[PDB]
Design a protein around this ligand. Structure first.
Ligand SMILES: [Ca+2]
Length: 240
């Protein structure tokens, strides 16, 4: 997250860190959202490569033991069947990971609230992006979880020629673009928490930003719109 600030200790309890084994150690690669004790929601492009993954819940500082973490392996990976690694712009950037074991819910670990199917947010709706991603274009990962206010940009404005044009589809959500704050590499797969009726719900899964950079004016971070996949998500967790 570029232009963000350190989130309070475990203040976004559904946020997870997706990591892969690098020889004899582990490295953070993407974010994700705990939606069931044994299911995590993330981006399909985070799990396209055949590596060994593990999920860390209750995480805050990636480089030190905070005494709140739970480390668990990944048993099954279910990518949306229409996902195309070579066309992220085509959408369908979403995947569900069945964990090898159910984590224990507590003060630091809780389930993320999903929106009702078909829910679209009004322009400039209040949302926050969280993640351990790059704190600057071509920079380095954040050691502690970061957060940044990132209001939405409706489809009409976001799909116009002044912003993303036709690269963005209605199955996506745009947020940010103030040229200062945004998602960045490493935040992918993470949540976009939006305030709806007094409650924070995960309306997006971080998908992509501009090739030119992370924080680019009129180039909002683009997220997979969760509300468009509710039926898919339920069908997966009901038959797996
Ligand atoms: Ca830690």
């Amino acid at each position: 997250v570029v232009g963000g600030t350190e989130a309070q200790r475990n203040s976004w309890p559904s946020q997870i860190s997706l990591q892969y084994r690098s020889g004899s150690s582990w490295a953070h690669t993407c974010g994700g959202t705990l939606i069931r004790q044994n299911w995590v929601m993330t981006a399909a492009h985070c799990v396209d490569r055949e590596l060994t993954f593990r999920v860390v819940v209750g995480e805050h500082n990636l480089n030190q033991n905070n005494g709140t973490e739970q480390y668990v392996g990944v048993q099954k990976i279910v990518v949306h069947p229409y996902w195309n690694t070579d066309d992220v712009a085509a959408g369908y950037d979403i995947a569900l990971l069945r964990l090898a074991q159910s984590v224990t819910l507590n003060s630091y670990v809780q389930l993320g609230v999903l929106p009702r199917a078909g829910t679209i947010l009004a322009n400039n709706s209040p949302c926050y992006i969280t993640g351990w991603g790059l704190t600057r274009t071509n920079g380095q990962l954040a050691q502690t979880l970061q957060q940044a206010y990132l209001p939405t940009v409706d489809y009409a404005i976001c799909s116009s020629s002044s912003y993303w044009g036709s690269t963005v589809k209605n199955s996506m959500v745009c947020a940010g673009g103030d040229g200062v704050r945004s998602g960045c590499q490493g935040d992918s797969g993470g949540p976009l928490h939006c305030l709806v009726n007094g409650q924070y719900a995960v309306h997006g899964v971080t998908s992509f930003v501009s090739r030119l950079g992370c924080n680019v004016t009129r180039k909002p971070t683009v997220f997979t719109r969760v509300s468009a996949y509710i039926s898919w998500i339920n069908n997966v967790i009901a038959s797996n």
